[PDB]
Amino acid sequence: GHMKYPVEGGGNQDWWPNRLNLKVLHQNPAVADPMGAAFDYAAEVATIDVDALTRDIEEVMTTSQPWWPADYGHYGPLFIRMAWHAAGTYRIHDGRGGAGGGMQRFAPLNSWPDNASLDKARRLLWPVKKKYGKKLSWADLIVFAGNCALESMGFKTFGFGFGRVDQWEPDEVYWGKEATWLGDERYSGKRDLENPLAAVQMGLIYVNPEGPNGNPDPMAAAVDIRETFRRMAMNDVETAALIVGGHTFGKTHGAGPADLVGPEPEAAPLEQMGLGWKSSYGTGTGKDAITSGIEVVWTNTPTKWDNSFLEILYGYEWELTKSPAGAWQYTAKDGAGAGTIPDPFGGPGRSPTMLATDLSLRVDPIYERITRRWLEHPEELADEFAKAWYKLIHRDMGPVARYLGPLVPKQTLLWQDPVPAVSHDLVGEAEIASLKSQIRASGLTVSQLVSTAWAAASSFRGSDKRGGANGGRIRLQPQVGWEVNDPDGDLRKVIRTLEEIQESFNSAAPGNIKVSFADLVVLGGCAAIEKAAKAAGHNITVPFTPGRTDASQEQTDVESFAVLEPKADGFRNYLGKGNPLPAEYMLLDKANLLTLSAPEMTVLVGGLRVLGANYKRLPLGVFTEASESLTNDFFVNLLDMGITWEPSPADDGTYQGKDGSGKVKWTGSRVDLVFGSNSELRALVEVYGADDAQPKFVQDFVAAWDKVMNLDRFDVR
Amino acid sequence: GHMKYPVEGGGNQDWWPNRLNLKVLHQNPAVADPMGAAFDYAAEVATIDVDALTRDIEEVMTTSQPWWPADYGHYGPLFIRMAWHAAGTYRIHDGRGGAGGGMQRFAPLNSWPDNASLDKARRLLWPVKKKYGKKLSWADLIVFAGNCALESMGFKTFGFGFGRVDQWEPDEVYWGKEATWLGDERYSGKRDLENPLAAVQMGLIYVNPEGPNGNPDPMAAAVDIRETFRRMAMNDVETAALIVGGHTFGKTHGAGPADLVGPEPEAAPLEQMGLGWKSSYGTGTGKDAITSGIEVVWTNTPTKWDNSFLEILYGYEWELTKSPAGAWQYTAKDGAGAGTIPDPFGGPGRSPTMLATDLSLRVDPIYERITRRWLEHPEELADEFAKAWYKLIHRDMGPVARYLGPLVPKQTLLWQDPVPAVSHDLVGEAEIASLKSQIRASGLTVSQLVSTAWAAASSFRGSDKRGGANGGRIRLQPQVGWEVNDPDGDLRKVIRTLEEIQESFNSAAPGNIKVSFADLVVLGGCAAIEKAAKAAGHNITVPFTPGRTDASQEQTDVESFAVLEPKADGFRNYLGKGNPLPAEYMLLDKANLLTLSAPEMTVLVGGLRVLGANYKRLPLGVFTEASESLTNDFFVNLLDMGITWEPSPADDGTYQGKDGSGKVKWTGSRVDLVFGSNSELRALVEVYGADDAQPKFVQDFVAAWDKVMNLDRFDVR
Ligand code: HEM
Ligand code: HEM
């Protein structure tokens, strides 16, 4: 190999290929954001004229463009494939992917094989982004072009939510190890797909449309449809609703050989202006379009909503054939329905065709039972496509407070993890003071208060903005019984105590003030950090924002919440079994999911350790001789060159630090030691380990802790 | 080949390996900085008791630590090598390298081979940094330790300035193409060393202590030293003074086999806490230490400033031999000097030894008379050394206004590109605003105004902070006939039209207020920009700050301003020969040297296009029909899908954009089109191309233009 200029990719990653990459803790840095620091997209969208945006979109859908003429003179279908592919990268394991950041316009997703032709699809909406400017993000516009497409073609959607903030540097997500497009190195066992992935091959949204590995077997393809969709929050009924209702519109494109198709956008020459997949077949567009290489037209009304798709799937029998590019697809046997399917540009009619994956809705017994009922009762299909399409293009929006606009329905949806609305006067500065003191007298230790508070709030992840302390769910299933949160039972004693305090406060309160459990969980950790700063000779108040309310078990989807459990949390020195990488990489990934910077991550580790927040209260990293005191001792001792460190003899992932006498003074994990070893983190430890650093250490730790307690509080922003 | 998790370095560089890398425009992001936004290092280092610091560094130097015992009981020489290596990465071609950022504490410099065992040298200064905290940067400290060490051991230095701010992420710099340490792929012809490097192998500071490619030919090593040191801005006399000066102290370390020496710090295990090159030879430290493999001790006074080096070099005859690690070195003939050189731990005492690099001082012609002189005139050695060492260590610190502390001598130095201080008074606001008219009322157009301003300020590189507009040096050589600056065009006409009004404003005689040329070059472009903005319905005011003064040709080292000649500047669509990478890369690179953000680069290019700023006022990129109007036109037309780009049939590295009618309407270069092709740039373009964007673009343009005019103005901080 050869080392390159940094402007062409070079860097220290090339000299130490598996080195921690701290650039994950500064994604989308403000230096790259062209908008001012005072710019609030939510404020812009709140003033947008929806009825004008809609018409300008319908005006775009029905005005063909010579560089990509419109099938049946309507782009609606194409925009549905666009919105579905923007949302369709979402995966449940890490919450990443999805439409919430508009990431389909940047690499690598803009160049994914399955996003072929969507480069053109987005281009067609620039006239729309231009008329509306800073009031409309690309993220909102992309997904809204589909919801407008549906309504325009006969399907009344459930509603819509604006508020997706545009970004400027693509989020980096691990999409698989395969270095080859459409590669498959992601299965083991009996068809067990590698977590966190949610697609069968590198570059696909979900499944191969020619069946597994290209084997056009409907019954097997359905195993993949079932499972990739599951990993995208869709059950059997939602998946069938989605596939059916989607293919009620539009058509495939495979008019000619696929080896006539040029390089993907990110690899294209300059003169193409961001567009890729340029084809020398015929016009290279329109009647000669080559997208997937398949050539199917599911319905006889490609631009209206009706029950044609299932009528057709069930009213013919199907045999296997080749498209003009040689891809597998099915056709109606015995020349049935010849000439019955309309042409994208006026040519002769054609005869019905389906994909392998479409036959799976009839051949699979679960899906047969679902689709046959909709054949006989199509109105059930409308209701389920409404719900599933809503879920799909909103799944990563986070709490409802974040949904803006006049088309936002008012109904509770379990998959949003609802939280009740405030019912009483929120707790003021005088009651917050009283409660910090009541909690400090309750008998709960500093460690109990800070662990519970952290466990509740750190359940947030910024990929999809699920999780967090609002809801009160640390006392509901499944969070009460996550291994990290409750090794030996202390958690339910804390819960018990905090509920007595809330009850007695609420029955004595002045007037109509009431505190929720969810708030007292957070308030308690703020109360302990104050007490523990005082013990170190710092008088400081920890901020606190009331407003959380208490969700109920019935309002908490236990299985949906399953993906949020930490298999590893380095802030509590917790390392469960089965993580993809060593503990220090997981630490950074957890730091990334909490939207934390390296300085913020560094300060919270050191504080949490001396506060006793360690899982099982283990001594790993607890480099202090004070109890329940918020000092910067973690940083000072990490830098003590009078300690010698070796891997512990029991090969237990711990380290032994010996002082001059050869006696063991400290013990540590890989997560602790990486702060003294990694030359960027050690730099940060030298900041907080200096003699003049303890007041700054305390202030910056309070700020980082307050930032974690508020991660889901979009109700106050 | 396998894609990796981002946290482990994976990203879109893996799928398109030569793609354009924009993080180069957000090095040292703010969210990675642990110091506040309001952190003011200058205001901190001013508080420092400099005498106490010196005393503390002194106590470090004489207290051996057991994990790296001190040769001769004094870490002074180690600290000087440390300091020489921290500065000794500098190179004149890009002004990158040098001690200004303290980059030796980070990758890859912390792990370069020549920087061996300096990890322990930096580790020894932790008690000092700990004591002084935020009032003292590692950058200042590393360098200042070497200066203190000199004085400590008998050499009075010319002085020292503070003010090098610590950074928190490596600066990634091209250090060569070789993917092997000590590798060599940089030499073509006969000894021609690829620009813009300044060392003979990958991971070296200058040259190979065993002669070129290990050939201990002093005469041949002299060619490397000369060419190598000249690229770090040292001439024959400076260079001879540094080698003699440095090797007055200390020794080399090669006590046993180098394969007993473990991995370098960035590849070393966690438990080594940032250190590397751990060694199973004997104790692995001290008398058994191994750093380079050579075992030479130059002087009999290794902790004192003497002339013993040159009396040894000339008082003996040097024959070839080998250290205990297969290392080529030189030693006395005939068993001369037996026992005269003392051992660093009370050993028996040894014969004299030199490096091949050392013998270049006696074998080469030019070095031999520099040196033979000093053999009888150590007062001249001493004087040149302090002159050169001072420069070696402040080369990248920029304008002398930046030098902080009580140790800065006021003597002007020529390499500092000195600028006369504001003698008279400066123009107040009613004087500036009364003075723009008299530039507007000149045959000078925006094209000549706006451009010439740009050519002045754009002279600045952020790497070593040299160049810039202050100094009036555009009137002077070599910025006079810089092929970018004048295609033999209106520059003199604008120069003398401005001098004409310089002579004219000062001769007016209102009092003390005299006006500098330099200040008017800058002021021209400002008012021009104001006219353009009114030419487009914006009554605008472009900020302006007086203070520049005009230097003289006698105070302008011409050979030292050569390396500031842009072989490329995309911002005026210029591209000479020789550039190592395509146009778009050198656009990004030049914007990095300008300390510009990607939003800033974009708004700038867009504005300068529509102002004829372009080299030879060529039409490439000028996507507007107005002249000298300030619009976003460049962005709007860049996003015009009715335009069709293809390379120009003439293959000039240009393109044509036809409007469907087949007639070329726009033409452009790569630099122009990369903004409409690259997915991240086009995102920006689409902010400033939108309908509601015109005010913000002007607003953002003035701010970004202001930034470039004010780059070197450290004199107003
Ligand atoms: C197993 C599931 C699915 C498979 C295998 C699949 C595959 C495909 C393929 C291969 C194409 C056309 C590619 C080309 O143009 O060459 C397509 C088109 C399309 N897909 Fe699907 N898809 C699936 C699910 C969905 C879903 C969930 C939706 C939306 C809710 C959807 C909506 C559409 C639409 C509207 C088109 C028409 C595009 C146009 O008219 O230009 N598909 N699908
Ligand atoms: C052609 C130029 C130079 C070459 C090839 C060179 C080479 C070397 C080498 C190989 C070592 C051995 C380090 C070890 O094994 O411990 C060394 C040590 C040293 N160098 Fe140089 N050097 C050069 C210029 C300089 C300059 C310009 C200075 C200072 C102005 C300097 C100061 C020192 C000092 C003080 C040491 C001793 C450090 C100690 O005692 O640990 N050298 N040099």
Contact state of B9 with A13 under an 8 Å Cβ cutoff: yes
**Burial classification of residue B98, based on how many CB atoms lie within 10 Å of its CB (0-12 exposed, 13-18 middle, 19 or more buried):** buried
CB-nearest to B271 from A14, A138, A655 is A655
Tally of CB atoms within 10 A around A335: 9
Residues of chain A neighbouring B103 (CB-CB closer than 8 A): none
* Nearest-angstrom CA–CA distance, A512 and A427: 10
Please choose, from the candidates A3, A588, A1, the residue with its C-alpha nearest in 3D space to the C-alpha of residue B1: A1
Residues of chain A neighbouring B693 (CB-CB closer than 8 A): 133-134
Look at the block and give the residue holding tokens 């063909």.
Answer: A64
Helices A679-688 and A598-611, packing angle to 10 deg: 60
Which residues, at least 6 apart from A227, have a Cβ–Cβ distance to it below 8 Å?
A193
Please choose, from the candidates A499, A493, A497, A528, the residue with its C-alpha nearest in 3D space to the C-alpha of residue A516: A499
Look at the block and give the residue holding tokens 């106590």.
Answer: B59
Contact state of A172 with B592 under an 8 Å Cβ cutoff: no
Do the beta carbons of residue B630 and residue B607 sit within 8 Å? yes
Tally of CB atoms within 10 A around A578: 7
* Nearest-angstrom CA–CA distance, A11 and A20: 13
Do the beta carbons of residue A294 and residue A248 sit within 8 Å? no
Tally of CB atoms within 10 A around A235: 12
Phi-psi region of B428 (alpha: psi -120 to 50; beta: other; left: phi over 0): beta
Look at the block and give the residue holding tokens 């690259």.
Answer: B678
Domain boundaries, chain A: 208-258+288-381, 429-566, 570-698
Please give the backbone phi and psi of residue B499, each rounded to the nearest 5 degrees, phi first.
Answer: -50, -40
Phi-psi region of A31 (alpha: psi -120 to 50; beta: other; left: phi over 0): alpha
Nearest CA residue ID for atom 14, ligand 2: B252
Contact state of A676 with B34 under an 8 Å Cβ cutoff: no
Residue B357 near ligand 2, beta carbon < 6 Å: yes
**Can you give B638-673 as a three-state secondary structure string?**
HCCCCCEEEECCCCCCEEEEECCCCCEEEEEEHHHH
Do the beta carbons of residue B657 and residue B711 sit within 8 Å? no
Residue B253 near ligand 2, beta carbon < 6 Å: yes
* Nearest-angstrom CA–CA distance, B277 and B290: 9
Ligand nearest to the CA of A299: 1
Please choose, from the candidates A459, A427, A464, the residue with its C-alpha nearest in 3D space to the C-alpha of residue A95: A464
* Nearest-angstrom CA–CA distance, B601 and B671: 12
Interface contacts (A, B; CB < 8 Å) = 310
CA–centroid distance, residue A247 to ligand 1 (Å): 6
End-to-end C-alpha distance for chain B, whole angstroms: 49
A36-39, long-range: CB < 8 A, 24+ apart: A39/A134
Residue A76 near ligand 1, beta carbon < 6 Å: no
Residue A246 near ligand 1, beta carbon < 6 Å: yes
* Nearest-angstrom CA–CA distance, B648 and B337: 74
Looking at the DSSP assignment, which residues form a beta bridge with residue A668? Answer: A655
Do the beta carbons of residue B316 and residue B337 sit within 8 Å? yes
CA–centroid distance, residue A113 to ligand 1 (Å): 13
CB-nearest to A598 from B32, B266, B676 is B32
Q: Which of B85, B93, B253, B377 is catalytic?
A: B85
**Burial classification of residue A163, based on how many CB atoms lie within 10 Å of its CB (0-12 exposed, 13-18 middle, 19 or more buried):** buried
Do the beta carbons of residue A518 and residue A550 sit within 8 Å? yes
Do the beta carbons of residue A419 and residue A551 sit within 8 Å? yes
Residue A390 near ligand 1, beta carbon < 6 Å: no
Pocket test for ligand 1, best of A81, A215, A294, A391 (most atoms within 8 A of CB): A81
CA–centroid distance, residue B272 to ligand 1 (Å): 54
Distance from the Cα of residue A604 to its chain's centroid: 24
- Residue in chain B closest to A638 (alpha carbons) equals B273
Q: What is residue B512's DSSP assignment?
A: S
Quote the tokens at residue A421.
């609305």
Q: Which of A273, A632, A655, A684 to mutate to test the interface with B (most CBs of B within 10 A)?
A: A273
* Nearest-angstrom CA–CA distance, A471 and A556: 9
Look at the block and give the residue holding tokens 């966690």.
Answer: B270
Helices B308-315 and B356-363, packing angle to 10 deg: 80
* Nearest-angstrom CA–CA distance, B287 and B432: 69
Please choose, from the candidates B211, B201, B206, the residue with its C-alpha nearest in 3D space to the C-alpha of residue B227: B206
Residue B78 near ligand 2, beta carbon < 6 Å: yes
**Strand-strand pairing, A568-569 and A353-354:** unpaired
Which residues, at least 6 apart from B496, have a Cβ–Cβ distance to it below 8 Å?
none
**Burial classification of residue B344, based on how many CB atoms lie within 10 Å of its CB (0-12 exposed, 13-18 middle, 19 or more buried):** buried
Which amino acid, A38?
A
Quote the tokens at residue A264.
């993907």
Helix, strand or coil for residue A658?
Answer: strand
Helix, strand or coil for residue B501?
Answer: helix
Write the DSSP assignment of A602-622 as a string of letters.
Answer: HHHHHHHHHHT-SGGG--TT-
* Nearest-angstrom CA–CA distance, B644 and B660: 7
CA–centroid distance, residue A250 to ligand 1 (Å): 8
Q: What is residue A647's DSSP assignment?
A: E
CA–centroid distance, residue B247 to ligand 2 (Å): 6
Protein fold of B570-704? Peroxidase; domain 2 (1.10.420)
Helix, strand or coil for residue B514?
Answer: coil
Contact state of B641 with A126 under an 8 Å Cβ cutoff: yes
Look at the block and give the residue holding tokens 């302006």.
Answer: B544
Do the beta carbons of residue B147 and residue B83 sit within 8 Å? yes
Residue A328 near ligand 1, beta carbon < 6 Å: no
Which residues, at least 6 apart from B65, have a Cβ–Cβ distance to it below 8 Å?
A641, B124
* Nearest-angstrom CA–CA distance, A236 and A230: 8
* Nearest-angstrom CA–CA distance, B27 and B37: 16
Residue A242 near ligand 1, beta carbon < 6 Å: yes
* Nearest-angstrom CA–CA distance, B627 and B611: 7
Residues of chain B neighbouring A33 (CB-CB closer than 8 A): 599
Look at the block and give the residue holding tokens 């013998």.
Answer: B359
Please choose, from the candidates A699, A682, A603, A673, the residue with its C-alpha nearest in 3D space to the C-alpha of residue B138: A682
Which residues, at least 6 apart from A79, have a Cβ–Cβ distance to it below 8 Å?
A61, A121, A125, A145, A146, A148, A149
Cα A562 to Cα A95, A477, A479, A480, A570: the distances in Å are 12, 10, 9, 12, 19
**Can you give A452-513 as a three-state secondary structure string?**
HHHHHHCCCCCCCCCCCCCECHHHCCCHHHCCCCCCCCHHHHHHHHHHHHHHHHHHHCCCCE
Tally of CB atoms within 10 A around B114: 23
> Could you identify the atom of ligand 2 that is nearest to the CA of residue B83?
29
Is the bond preceding B196 in cis, omega lying within 30 degrees of 0?
Answer: yes
Residue A207 near ligand 1, beta carbon < 6 Å: yes
Please give the backbone phi and psi of residue A199, each rounded to the nearest 5 degrees, phi first.
Answer: -135, 155
Cα B12 to Cα A176, B30, B556, B655: the distances in Å are 13, 23, 45, 27
**If residue A664 lies in a helix (H) or strand (E), which one and from where to where?**
strand A664-669
Do the beta carbons of residue A71 and residue A250 sit within 8 Å? yes
Range B566-601 burial, b when 16+ CB lie within 10 A, else e: bbbbbbbbbbeeeeebbbbbbbbbbbbbbbbbbbbb
Tally of CB atoms within 10 A around A17: 10
**If residue B587 lies in a helix (H) or strand (E), which one and from where to where?**
helix B583-593
**Burial classification of residue A644, based on how many CB atoms lie within 10 Å of its CB (0-12 exposed, 13-18 middle, 19 or more buried):** middle
Please choose, from the candidates B543, B508, B550, the residue with its C-alpha nearest in 3D space to the C-alpha of residue B436: B543
* Nearest-angstrom CA–CA distance, B108 and B103: 9
Quote the tokens at residue B202.
């990958």
CB-nearest to A273 from B35, B173, B676 is B676
Residues of chain A neighbouring B30 (CB-CB closer than 8 A): 29-31
Do the beta carbons of residue A638 and residue A623 sit within 8 Å? yes
CA–centroid distance, residue B706 to ligand 2 (Å): 44
* Nearest-angstrom CA–CA distance, B454 and B615: 11
Which residues, at least 6 apart from B402, have a Cβ–Cβ distance to it below 8 Å?
B161, B163, B465, B714
- The experimental method behind these coordinates is X-ray
Enumerate the known binding-site residues of B for heme b: 247
* Nearest-angstrom CA–CA distance, B58 and B73: 12
Dihedral sign of CA atoms B413, B418, B424, B428 in order: negative
Superfamily, domain B187-267+278-375: Peroxidase, domain 2 (1.10.420.10)
CB-nearest to A32 from B7, B106, B599 is B599
Top-level class of domain A570-698:
mainly alpha
Which residues, at least 6 apart from A487, have a Cβ–Cβ distance to it below 8 Å?
A615, A616
* Nearest-angstrom CA–CA distance, A145 and A152: 10
CA–centroid distance, residue B414 to ligand 2 (Å): 27
Enumerate the known binding-site residues of B: 247
Phi-psi region of B117 (alpha: psi -120 to 50; beta: other; left: phi over 0): left
Contact state of A690 with B179 under an 8 Å Cβ cutoff: no
Pocket test for ligand 2, best of B224, B247, B287, B363 (most atoms within 8 A of CB): B247
* Topology match between the domains B429-565 and B570-704: no
Cα B321 to Cα B294, B296, B325, B352, B527: the distances in Å are 11, 11, 11, 12, 70
Q: Which CATH number fits domain A208-258+288-381: 1.10.10.350, 1.10.420.10, 1.10.3470.10, 3.30.1330.60?
A: 1.10.420.10
Q: Which CATH number fits domain B429-565: 3.10.310.30, 3.40.50.300, 1.25.40.10, 1.10.520.10?
A: 1.10.520.10
CA atoms within 13 Å, Cβ hemisphere of B81: 21
Helix, strand or coil for residue A197?
Answer: coil
Quote the tokens at residue A86.
């923007």
> Could you identify the atom of ligand 2 that is nearest to the CA of residue B207?
5
Do the beta carbons of residue A134 and residue B692 sit within 8 Å? yes
* Nearest-angstrom CA–CA distance, A390 and B240: 76
Residues of chain A neighbouring B273 (CB-CB closer than 8 A): 638, 645, 673, 676-677, 682
| A85 classed as catalytic | yes
Distance from the Cα of residue B368 to its chain's centroid: 31
* Nearest-angstrom CA–CA distance, A125 and A76: 12
Please choose, from the candidates A291, A206, A199, A208, the residue with its C-alpha nearest in 3D space to the C-alpha of residue A250: A291
Quote the tokens at residue B77.
């020489």
Do the beta carbons of residue B599 and residue B684 sit within 8 Å? yes
**How many helices and strands, by DSSP H and E, does chain B display?**
23, 10
Q: What is residue B205's DSSP assignment?
A: S
Looking at the DSSP assignment, which residues form a beta bridge with residue B187? Answer: B193
Nearest CA residue ID for atom 2, ligand 2: B243
Quote the tokens at residue B623.
């996507």
Contact state of B645 with A272 under an 8 Å Cβ cutoff: yes
Contact state of B679 with A126 under an 8 Å Cβ cutoff: no
- Residue in chain A closest to B684 (alpha carbons) equals A34
* Nearest-angstrom CA–CA distance, A544 and A433: 10
Rg (CA), chain B: 28
* Nearest-angstrom CA–CA distance, B331 and B323: 10
**If residue A669 lies in a helix (H) or strand (E), which one and from where to where?**
strand A664-669
Please choose, from the candidates A502, A500, A460, A495, the residue with its C-alpha nearest in 3D space to the C-alpha of residue A480: A495
Range A449-488 burial, b when 16+ CB lie within 10 A, else e: bbbbbbbbbbbbbbbbbbbbbbbbbbbbebbeebebbbee
- Give 3-state DSSP helix, strand, coil % of chain B, rounded to 5: 45, 5, 50
B49-52, long-range: CB < 8 A, 24+ apart: B50/B405, B50/B406, B50/B407
Which residues, at least 6 apart from B555, have a Cβ–Cβ distance to it below 8 Å?
B412, B414, B417, B418
Is the bond preceding A196 in cis, omega lying within 30 degrees of 0?
Answer: yes
Dihedral sign of CA atoms B372, B378, B380, B385 in order: positive
- Residue in chain B closest to A701 (alpha carbons) equals B34
Look at the block and give the residue holding tokens 């001013």.
Answer: B46
**Strand-strand pairing, B568-569 and B574-575:** antiparallel
Residues of chain A neighbouring B16 (CB-CB closer than 8 A): 107, 266-267
Quote the tokens at residue B273.
């806490």
Cα A418 to Cα A122, A164, A412, B517: the distances in Å are 33, 19, 7, 68
Top-level class of domain A429-566:
mainly alpha
Residues of chain A neighbouring B111 (CB-CB closer than 8 A): 15
Please choose, from the candidates B25, B5, B15, the residue with its C-alpha nearest in 3D space to the C-alpha of residue B584: B25
* Nearest-angstrom CA–CA distance, B547 and B514: 11
* Nearest-angstrom CA–CA distance, A83 and A104: 10
CA–centroid distance, residue A199 to ligand 2 (Å): 57
Which amino acid, B642?
G
Looking at the DSSP assignment, which residues form a beta bridge with residue B341? Answer: B350
Which amino acid, B265?
P
**Burial classification of residue A333, based on how many CB atoms lie within 10 Å of its CB (0-12 exposed, 13-18 middle, 19 or more buried):** exposed
Nearest CA residue ID for atom 41, ligand 2: B78
Looking at the DSSP assignment, which residues form a beta bridge with residue B657? Answer: B645, B666
**If residue A665 lies in a helix (H) or strand (E), which one and from where to where?**
strand A664-669
Pocket test for ligand 1, best of A80, A120, A236, A287 (most atoms within 8 A of CB): A80
CB-nearest to B177 from A3, A179, A646 is A3
Ligand nearest to the CA of B114: 2
Q: Which of A85, A253, A394, A538 is catalytic?
A: A85
* Nearest-angstrom CA–CA distance, A249 and A80: 8
**Burial classification of residue B510, based on how many CB atoms lie within 10 Å of its CB (0-12 exposed, 13-18 middle, 19 or more buried):** exposed
